[PDB]
Each structure stands twice: as structure tokens, then as C-alpha cells.
Amino acid sequence: RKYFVAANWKCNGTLESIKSLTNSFNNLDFDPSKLDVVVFPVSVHYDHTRKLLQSKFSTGIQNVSKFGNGSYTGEVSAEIAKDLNIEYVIIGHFERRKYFHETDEDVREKLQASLKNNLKAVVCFGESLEQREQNKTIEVITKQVKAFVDLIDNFDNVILVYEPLWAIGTGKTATPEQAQLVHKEIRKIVKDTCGEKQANQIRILYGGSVNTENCSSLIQQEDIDGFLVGNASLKESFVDIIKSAM
Amino acid sequence: RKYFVAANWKCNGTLESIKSLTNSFNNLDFDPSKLDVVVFPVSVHYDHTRKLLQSKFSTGIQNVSKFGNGSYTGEVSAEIAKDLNIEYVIIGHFERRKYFHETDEDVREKLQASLKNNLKAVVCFGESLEQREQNKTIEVITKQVKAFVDLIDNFDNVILVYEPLWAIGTGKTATPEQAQLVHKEIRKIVKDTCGEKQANQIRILYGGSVNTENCSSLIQQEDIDGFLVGNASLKESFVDIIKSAM
Incomplete structure (x- = not known):
């Protein structure tokens, strides 16, 4: 199956820091038909990022609404995302389940809304230390x-x-x-x-403190198809993580 | 007085489980000049543990001999411990008094030997259910x-x-x-x-089923200066117990 590497910038960035970062990313020569590389900037940064990034890079948003268009102040619906040709959405990320009270019910409704509008989704799950x-x-x-x-x-x-x-x-x-x-x-x-x-055929990625030093050993595992990278994706060295998957 | 938190791993661990555990412990940012945190691994695990643990953590052994150097097969003398720069020793732990026949006389002789060799000692005592x-x-x-x-x-x-x-x-x-x-x-x-x-100035700690849920209320008491933690110290969540004392 096609390896998948996702950059989740979370709540970080400025117009200038993004210009510098996208610049380094664009320098990496890779074949998008052999590897999927998706960048998820903050919502208000989407247009700016999509423009700076070369077409070999896919883009998406960090969250989507479980509701449709309507009276839901502050939310972005799947219909709106499709109208903008946003390709991917992240659903169920730990931070939304934790700080915000997103439940498995919200995760399923958001996925249903995304698939309904032909959006590709990156669905997250995992156990807490206590459960482990x-x-x-x-x-x-x-x-x-x-x-x-x-x-x-x-x-x-x-x-x-x-x-x-x-x-x-x-x-x-x-x-x-x-x-x-x-x-x-x-x-x-x-x-x-x-x-x-x-x-x-389904890709199952690992997320959680992936960096340039440990990425190689992780991707080598038979059932690990790539990663969801957080803090390490805010650095120019992120390109080496992408390299480990090609 | 300076709070004191001791991890008594008792008779548990493997080279790998210790590597994983020390890793989590090292991630906790704390000031050793404001809090004492001592880890007591099994004797044959001492060198391995001391190496993996950052210098902010102190280490020691779970028992020491009441005799000096000489013909005492199976024992570790205070002189030998000092030569290795082992900082602490536990003396009089319930398990040694119970399964082994260590008496108050052994406790005093072991303490005398430890202080004589400039070792710091953690001395235990307590009553049985019957006595209570x-x-x-x-x-x-x-x-x-x-x-x-x-x-x-x-x-x-x-x-x-x-x-x-x-x-x-x-x-x-x-x-x-x-x-x-x-x-x-x-x-x-x-x-x-x-x-x-x-x-x-002397620290008096409490030991006996201390966990992440009850540690806060215990350390708050005016005369409880920390704890001797057993089973809860074999888990990565042990860091939260240390946090309750900082």
C-alpha cells in the first residue's frame, strides 16, 4: 500500500514562518504517485499554504463539523470544505477529545459527513497511560x-x-x-x-513523538504505513521524515 | 524541610523494562535541590539503572550488611557501597524483618555501619495489624x-x-x-x-500503598515529608506521585 506522511501544524505559524517552511518542503523531490504527503495548516492559513506549496503536496484542515451548513457559529462544514476542494480532514485527534469534549459519537458523525461530501479522512484513536x-x-x-x-x-x-x-x-x-x-x-x-x-489496503499510521531519529525503525514495521507528525513537522528537517518513507 | 520520594522497585525488572521506565522518569523536569528523588533497583541492576537515570535522580540499594568486609557470602558491605559511590541504602524494610529474620538489633548495626561509611539511610519501622x-x-x-x-x-x-x-x-x-x-x-x-x-529537620515518610490518587492528601499533612513507594513505582505514572511533592 502507499505510504502516508501527514504534517499536523496544529495551532502554530505566521505568514512568514509558513513561507520559510513551505520553501524547504518544496525543495524535496518526491513522487506523489508513490507517496502521499499531506499538510494540515490552521484554517485561516489554508489558502496561503495551498498557494505556497507545490502541487505534489496535498493539504487539508485539522477539524470539520459534525453538522451541515446552518446555524453553527465557529464551525466549518464538510460541504464548505468540498466547495474549496480541500482534500483531507483530521477527525478525532486526541486534543479535540481532551480539551474539547469530542466523543466517539462525534467522530462517527464527522466521518459520515466527510465521506458524504467526498472528503478523505484521517481518523485518530488511542489509549491513555492509565488504560495502558x-x-x-x-x-x-x-x-x-x-x-x-x-x-x-x-x-x-x-x-x-x-x-x-x-x-x-x-x-x-x-x-x-x-x-x-x-x-x-x-x-x-x-x-x-x-x-x-x-x-x-487501508493505511494505519502511527502518531506520537515521531522524529528524524526514530522514523526509520517505525516505518519499517509490517503494519505501520506512515505517520501523523506534530511538533517535528514545524521544522525544516521534516523533509528527512518524508525521506524515510520513500 | 526537603520533601523525599523513594522508589523501591523491590525484586522486579529486566534490562528492557528498566530502560523503558527510566526513560519516562527522565522526562520529568524537577529541581533536585528542592526535592530528593531516590530510586532503589535490585543490586545486579544498579550500574545499568544509574547509567540510564539522569543525575537529578539519586540511587541506592535495598539492603546492606551488618558486617564489614569479610567471609559473609551473599552480603554487600557498606564499605563496598561507598567504593561504588552508592548514595543511599534501605534498612529494616518490613519484608526483610518478615521473610528474613532481621531484628531491631540488625537494624541498628546496619545503620551504624552505614553512617560509619558515610552512606545515607532510609530506616523503616511499623506495626502489624494485630498490634494495631x-x-x-x-x-x-x-x-x-x-x-x-x-x-x-x-x-x-x-x-x-x-x-x-x-x-x-x-x-x-x-x-x-x-x-x-x-x-x-x-x-x-x-x-x-x-x-x-x-x-x-529529620524527614519522616509514609510507606504503604501510596498511589497517584492518594499521594496528594498524604503529603499535605504537617508531619509527612514524603513517601517510600513500592508497586506504584514500577509504573510510568510514578511521575505524578513525584509531582505531588513539588
Whole structure:
């Protein structure tokens, strides 16, 4: 399957810092028909970023509404995103589940809205440190995936992201062994509930303190198809992470 | 006085599990001149642990011999510990008094040997459930402390640990009120036998099923200066217990 590398800039950037960063990104020579590279800038930065980035790079937004067009002040609907030809959306990111009270119900409704409007979605899930120490990792992960897996119709348009909460922006990356185990179990869940062909074509990425030093060993794992990169994507060295996947 | 938090790994660990654990511990940003944090790995794990742990963490061993260098197969003398620059030693832990037949006499001789070799010691004592139900708590505790208190010359180098036997690894922690009462009586014993200045500078920790949920309320007590943590110290969440003391 095609490897996938996503840059989640989260809530960072200025018009100038983005110009400098996109410049470095554009210098990397890579074939978009062999590797997917998506950049997710802040909403108000979308037009600026899409313009500066070369067409080989795909772009998207960090969140989308579970509602349609209407009286929902502050939200961006899937219909609006499609009108702008925004290709991807991130759904269920830990930070939205944590600081904001997004639940599995919100995740499934947002995915349904996205697929309905032909948007490609990057869906995140993962267990907290407390759940891991209680050995509930697989139980929690299974519940989270089952909350929306039946909605997936085209397995090339939905990308799964295993995000252990304890590894997000902390510097404590999951070891290749740890991640591989979880990814293998996730694909088995998909295989058994959706089908083997489907399971083998869906990308399952790892997210959580991925950097230029550990990316190579992680992507080498049989069931890790790429990554969702946070803080490391705000640096010019991010290009080396992309290189590890080509 | 400076709070003190001790991680007693007891008889647990593998080279790999220690690498993962020390990694999480190293991520906690804390000032060692404001808080003492000591880790006690198994003897054969000492070098490995000392190397992996950052210098902000102090280390020690779980037991020391009451004899000096010589024909005592299986023992580690205080002289040997000092040669290795091992900073702390635990003395009189319930498990050594119980499974092994260490008595108050052994506790005092081991402390004398430790202080003689400039080692800092964490001395444990506490009453059994049977003694508590007979209302002999203070009587038993007083006898145990009096067995070695005259040997203390530097009150910053000896740390006392009130370990109610019924609270060790059982999950039944002493309530803040219970512990506070006992700690207050212990400090009064020291005050009256050694002096007020001495009594006010010596750390008296509580040990017995301390976890991330109850640590805050315990450390808040006026005479509880920290803890000796067992099972909860084998988990990455141990960092939250350290946080409660900073």
C-alpha cells in the first residue's frame, strides 16, 4: 500500500514562518504517485499554504463539523470544505477529545459527513497511560474503531491513526515493537469486520513523538504505513521524515 | 524541610523494562535541590539503572550488611557501597524483618555501619495489624525507633519511614489522619530524645500503598515529608506521585 506522511501544524505559524517552511518542503523531490504527503495548516492559513506549496503536496484542515451548513457559529462544514476542494480532514485527534469534549459519537458523525461530501479522512484513536497500565489498550482501541468502521466504503479514502496519548508531544515514542503489535491487532479487527482485501489496503499510521531519529525503525514495521507528525513537522528537517518513507 | 520520594522497585525488572521506565522518569523536569528523588533497583541492576537515570535522580540499594568486609557470602558491605559511590541504602524494610529474620538489633548495626561509611539511610519501622488492633501501635513504634535513634549524628542523612505492615502492597492505605497522628508522635520522640532542632529537620515518610490518587492528601499533612513507594513505582505514572511533592 502507499505510504502516508501527514504534517499536523496544529495551532502554530505566521505568514512568514509558513513561507520559510513551505520553501524547504518544496525543495524535496518526491513522487506523489508513490507517496502521499499531506499538510494540515490552521484554517485561516489554508489558502496561503495551498498557494505556497507545490502541487505534489496535498493539504487539508485539522477539524470539520459534525453538522451541515446552518446555524453553527465557529464551525466549518464538510460541504464548505468540498466547495474549496480541500482534500483531507483530521477527525478525532486526541486534543479535540481532551480539551474539547469530542466523543466517539462525534467522530462517527464527522466521518459520515466527510465521506458524504467526498472528503478523505484521517481518523485518530488511542489509549491513555492509565488504560495502558491497566492492560486495557486493545479493549479501548477496539471500542474506538468499532464506533465508526462500518461507515468506511472506500478503503483508500480513510486513513487510521494510532495515537497513544502518552506519546503525543511528550518525547516518549512507542517502540517499534509496541506500535507494531497494536497496528497488527487493528488490521485484524478490520479484516474480521470488513474483509481481508479491505484490511490489506487501508493505511494505519502511527502518531506520537515521531522524529528524524526514530522514523526509520517505525516505518519499517509490517503494519505501520506512515505517520501523523506534530511538533517535528514545524521544522525544516521534516523533509528527512518524508525521506524515510520513500 | 526537603520533601523525599523513594522508589523501591523491590525484586522486579529486566534490562528492557528498566530502560523503558527510566526513560519516562527522565522526562520529568524537577529541581533536585528542592526535592530528593531516590530510586532503589535490585543490586545486579544498579550500574545499568544509574547509567540510564539522569543525575537529578539519586540511587541506592535495598539492603546492606551488618558486617564489614569479610567471609559473609551473599552480603554487600557498606564499605563496598561507598567504593561504588552508592548514595543511599534501605534498612529494616518490613519484608526483610518478615521473610528474613532481621531484628531491631540488625537494624541498628546496619545503620551504624552505614553512617560509619558515610552512606545515607532510609530506616523503616511499623506495626502489624494485630498490634494495631490491640492498641499497641505507639508502644511498638517507640520501641523500634529507640532501638537506633541514638546513632543518628546528621539528621539530614537519615530518613525515617513509617510502614504500617497492613498497608504494604495490600491497597489499604492509612488515611491522612491515621498517618499524621503516628508521624506527629514519632517526631515528638525524636524531639524529646535528640532535640527540637534535630526533630524539625529529620524527614519522616509514609510507606504503604501510596498511589497517584492518594499521594496528594498524604503529603499535605504537617508531619509527612514524603513517601517510600513500592508497586506504584514500577509504573510510568510514578511521575505524578513525584509531582505531588513539588
